[PDB]
Amino acid sequence: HSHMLAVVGDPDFTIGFMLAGISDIYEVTSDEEIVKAVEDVLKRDDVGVVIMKQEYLKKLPPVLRREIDEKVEPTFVSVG
Template sequence: MEIAIIGERDFTIGFQLCGIKNIANIEESDYSEFNSVFMQTIENTEVGIIVVNEGYYQKIPVQIRKKLEKLVSPVVVTLSDEESAGGADLRNLIKRSLGVDLWKE
């Protein structure tokens, strides 16, 4: 399984430095390009995790986001420039993809 990163160059550069090869750089605020690349990435059976900027993810049509929430693979992880309480979302993503609640007490 591969990890795919989709976003502006400033967003993707750190992932490139970590050695991730499946990177799609999107021109700033080009949501049509993002949607096109995102849909192609979802259909790629080699990709297990897709990391996108939360701002771009919010521009995806609601019906597609609802469909993604039900999929086991790929798992879509959104990251934000702002600090937020995303721990619960990450917990749900891991539980859905692994089938185990790692934070269960």
């Protein structure tokens, strides 16, 4: 039971958040890396919210998309 804020994205997308003191970030580039990160963030029990590019869901297999569709917790926030 913890509600950490995690961010997932390329290094250019992450810096703004790190400088802002957000250390729960997942650096990502490879399509495979995007999907694992999301799998990983879902395996966690301390994440409450996760920021992401709106252009990342498409890259996630049907299972994951619906898996995060429920979105009981963490609440996904997608940067348009």
